[PDB]
Design a protein around this ligand. Structure first.
Ligand SMILES: [Mg+2]
Ligand SMILES: [Mg+2]
Lengths: 328, 328
């Protein structure tokens, strides 16, 4: 449809290119424009044994229909140095951010209805001397978004996180009224606007096991979480909880739920990965644009070996398509 | 050779008595002795519209054969006050602990092969002025066991915990070389001795997300967990990890392990409950006796209603029977 999507293979030495090529074996419901190096993809394809019709595409006139099953659109972006699967090279660090910038600005301009990102390697970018806090932070800065919320999803289950990549010992003190308020509002606003859910029903996990057990297993629920959720409900948000995480994450309770708000990383991702057989899409909430991503790393050691699972990227693409439909 | 098992209905006002009465409709493979008030059981039976014959048991003659279908052995233990389903009464707190003591001491004295516990209400016990941390802690003290290991299980999945009922902020400092080492050894030994697994394959979770990510998200894996597990692997224990929790909990890996060892409550139980809530048994490892239990609450508002699921307690019974046969 008139809805175009930018696909960023990410770190050239990683499986990003691989995955994108593998998913090029099937025709897409929409024109999927891969912003990367033609040569990169060509070689990776040859290395994988696969055969894809890397069809060049120019900003002068974007495509209109999806590439044939075995073809992949490519908005060529030059590498700085040749590539070898599984071998990082700081010389190509700028090339990575270039693809991300093209993809992000494209969405901001309206040429792209949304973007899907394959794995990037933070370490090699920092080694090139390029300021890079991370994949998500980069896009946030590009879109001038001060606050974002990380929401993981698999078919039939969405889990937003109050805290993300932090040592477990730093979690408890990070749970504040301010933090929960910011996260809840963004989660609500986006499920409504980007997923077409008028009144999102969000189940909220307690921080402590058994959600603090009436205050006998931690005080955070009584002192912080409960008062916060109470105020938010009065403001219109349908937040249910705090509920014990191991009670909430069950078919019964999830049946009438649009998303689960977990307090920290390992409290919500295991169930999601279990359910989806390791396939999960990472959605950045709070941005003016639509962006999804796979949750796994670059897997340098598996690059060009074909021994990879494209489930995550597959789910990442579908989620992006759906969001655009509901309205960006 | 004859094996007797103690059964404790637990909190009188809860559904424990109900569950024990319902399961009594089927003849057991071993004599199952309910340690509770005979009058309580007879009244709850009438309340439920169930026809169960209560056969008195004397410590002077522990029955060798199982009771008949529709019959339940009862070692009468007096209540302090009449019981009203759904209504807690601190006057009966001592009664609860008395039945637990009789069961535990009965195993320690060699009369019982194991014990199965139905739900108890910790709150009413503490309100009666009796220090009680919970079921597991009470038994560890009664048996003078310094370290026990809580393991939840359902068909196809067993999850042991390094720490249990602890506020999240206390978890990190609790993961010590001493604790982890004891916990791992107990899990390996019991899977070998009580579950008949010659060479247990155990997947171990890191404390931090991504298992610390090379020490970038916490140093515990590097400084404590890795060294400990490495030490034990050098002793023949097939422990794999530490690995990211959301990686270990994928079908791909679970299919090849005998148990998962999570560092804390909400890191491992959500997946277990998602997979087998309603057929999940809580097994206390490390005790000099065998004890299993359900992991649901007393459901005070369902007492006397008959709208309950005895599936969990059923699995708890079968698990104790199997463990005892395997050998305490
Ligand atoms: Mg629990
Ligand atoms: Mg992660």
């Amino acid at each position: 449809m008139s809805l175009r999507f930018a696909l960023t293979p990410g770190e050239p030495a990683g499986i990003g290119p691989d995955l994108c090529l593998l998913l090029a074996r099937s025709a897409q419901p929409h024109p999927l424009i891969a912003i990367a190096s033609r040569t990169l993809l060509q070689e990776r394809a040859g290395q994988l044994g696969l055969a894809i019709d890397l069809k060049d595409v120019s900003p002068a006139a974007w495509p209109e229909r999806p590439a044939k099953a075995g073809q992949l659109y490519v908005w060529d972006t030059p590498l700085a140095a040749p590539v070898r699967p599984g071998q990082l090279d700081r010389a190509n660090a700028a090339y990575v951010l270039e693809t991300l910038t093209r993809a992000g600005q494209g969405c901001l301009d309206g040429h792209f209805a949304g973007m899907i990102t394959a794995p990037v390697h933070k370490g090699v970018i920092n080694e090139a001397g390029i300021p890079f806090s991370g994949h998500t932070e980069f896009l946030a800065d590009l879109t001038h978004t001060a606050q974002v919320v990380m929401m993981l999803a698999t078919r039939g289950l969405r889990v937003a996180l109050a805290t993300t990549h932090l040592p477990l010992r730093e979690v408890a003190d990070a749970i504040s009224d301010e933090r929960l308020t910011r996260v809840a509002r963004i989660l609500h606003a986006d499920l409504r606007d980007k997923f077409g859910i008028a009144h999102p029903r969000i189940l909220v996990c307690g921080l402590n096991p058994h959600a603090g057990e009436g205050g006998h297993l931690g005080r955070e629920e009584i002192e912080v979480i409960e008062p916060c959720l109470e105020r938010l409900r009065g403001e219109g948000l349908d937040l249910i909880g705090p509920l014990p995480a191991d009670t909430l994450f069950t078919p019964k309770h999830l049946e009438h739920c649009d998303a689960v708000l977990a307090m920290y990383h390992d409290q919500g991702l295991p169930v999601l990965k279990y359910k989806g057989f390791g396939a999960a899409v990472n959605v950045t909430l709070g941005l003016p644009i639509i962006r999804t991503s796979v949750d796994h790393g670059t897997a340098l050691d598996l690059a060009g070996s074909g021994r990879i699972d494209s489930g995550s990227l597959q789910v990442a693409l579908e989620t992006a398509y759906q969001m655009a439909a509901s309205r960006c």
